[PDB]
């Protein structure tokens, strides 16, 4: 009757991975070939899915009464604080590369380094989301500093208040309906977070006399770091690195939006008679339990238990094999989002089966409802 860990020594690979574009660069300059900038894009899409399948499932689920034990070893949180700084290095160093060697690089390599640093910005946000749902002060300010390096400092207010109030609900801009491409979704999504956060802090402060443009606003507080960062880095390295700083940013935002897509895709909460909505449940969130993908993204593939208890560090999060189950880990499902028709070849049927085959529990894209119900025989 023991919880001997399994992955314990191997959580420091998370200090490693954020430096993959940099040693990609070094290697690509010493050996003298060209593809070696496109190295994160291969690690993430082709060696981690293979390796995923090569290892297997995880054999570690914490039981119930060990949570108050697993939330008292500080190693699991020092490994997130240390990750916050490395991220600025990767950005600054890479940009100084392109400008210190514009005159020996092609344009392939520029696009490539930009994409690599974009994926690593996904890991900044997955280190900001894990350090926001905390109840200390240190963790919160660190969340904002780390999020500032991609310009997504309002994720704070947005994710917590909104997403955690109305996940799986017609009026949450992140819950994706069933029958909608990630393209039209990204449209309806990216402005959603911004508009909503702005209104939200406005109406909070308004109860008071401390005018909208204040200091304590947490949506315009990390712009004080993203504005100087870019103005400096750019006007120092010269205007030459503008075609590479935009690519990195857009790919970061794409990373975040694809996740939200495949997390709560198609799932809906039932309506209480003549009242409000029903509180979140376990069977409204997709999750997986493969090993190395979890090791990279601190267990995030276990989303249901996350919504089950927001405040719980990434070492007590349980696993469940009878709630909804994805087919694979996160990289392949990413690779399937971008191409919608096959996405519909697969996760359509899964969603119909696990949710219950009927139109009072699934959330159908409110632009084509009549088709979506007429075909795929459903019930109303």
């Amino acid at each position, epitope marked *: 009757i023991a919880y001997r860990d399994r992955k314990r020594p191997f959580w420091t690979l998370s200090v490693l991975w954020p430096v993959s574009p940099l040693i990609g660069i070094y290697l690509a300059h010493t050996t003298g070939v060209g593809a070696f900038f496109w190295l994160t894009l291969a690690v993430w899409y082709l060696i981690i899915p293979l390796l995923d399948w090569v290892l297997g499932d995880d054999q570690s689920n914490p039981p119930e*009464a060990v949570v108050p034990a697993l939330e008292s070893d500080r190693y699991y949180r020092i490994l997130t604080y240390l990750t916050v700084p490395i991220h600025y290095v990767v950005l600054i160093g890479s940009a100084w590369y392109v400008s210190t060697h514009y005159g020996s690089m092609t344009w392939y390599d520029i696009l490539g380094l930009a994409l690599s640093v974009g994926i690593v910005n996904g890991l900044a946000i997955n280190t900001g989301h894990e350090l926001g749902h905390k109840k200390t002060e240190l963790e919160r300010w660190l969340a904002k500093i780390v999020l500032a390096v991609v310009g997504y400092g309002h994720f704070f207010i947005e994710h917590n208040k909104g997403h955690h109030k109305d996940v799986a609900t017609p009026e949450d801009p992140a819950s994706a309906p069933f029958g909608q491409s990630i393209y039209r979704f990204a449209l309806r999504e990216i402005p959603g977070a911004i508009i909503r956060a702005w209104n939200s802090e406005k109406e909070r402060l308004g109860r008071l006399g401390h005018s909208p443009w204040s200091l304590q606003n947490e949506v315009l507080q990390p712009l004080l770091i993203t504005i100087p960062l870019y103005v400096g880095l750019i006007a120092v390295l010269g205007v030459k690195i503008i075609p590479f700083l935009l690519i990195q940013i857009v790919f970061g935002w794409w990373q975040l939006t694809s996740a939200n897509y495949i997390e709560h895709y198609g799932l809906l909460r039932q309506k209480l008679p003549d009242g409000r909505y029903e509180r979140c449940q376990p069977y409204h969130s997709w999750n997986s339990n493969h090993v190395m993908s979890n090791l990279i993204l601190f267990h995030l593939q276990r989303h249901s238990d996350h919504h089950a208890h927001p405040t719980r560090r990434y070492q007590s999060l349980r696993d469940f094999p009878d709630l909804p189950t994805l087919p694979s880990g996160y990289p392949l499902m990413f690779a399937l989002s971008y191409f919608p028709p096959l996405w519909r070849a697969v996760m359509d049927r899964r969603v119909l089966d696990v949710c219950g085959r009927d139109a009072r529990k699934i959330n159908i894209d409110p632009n084509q409802r009549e088709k979506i119900i007429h075909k795929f025989n459903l019930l109303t």
Partner: nanobody
Amino acid sequence: QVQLQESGGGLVQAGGSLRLSCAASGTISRYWTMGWYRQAPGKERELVAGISEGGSTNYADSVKGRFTISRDNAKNTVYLQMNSLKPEDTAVYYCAVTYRGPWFNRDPHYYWGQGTQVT
């Protein structure tokens, strides 16, 4: 083998004292900290007591001043003589123990058991 037997349950008056104890066995190691964890109804298990090889208390601030946890007996032995009973704290108690390896290793081995539902 490795398990954690205990004693010390019952019902007493609110304003009395009681003593918890659980004695494990079969230890091939010598670095750890043995502690109590209580489960208030509707409450996720919070920490109550646990003492390290050297001896350094970490209670939860709500029990500070009434509960004490000590050893000084044959190996794999720990005590908690509780006092000043309230009906607001009445729960089930696991007696929990841990382990340790060279800092480099630091493979934490956790072991659990429960019983002695207080009042």
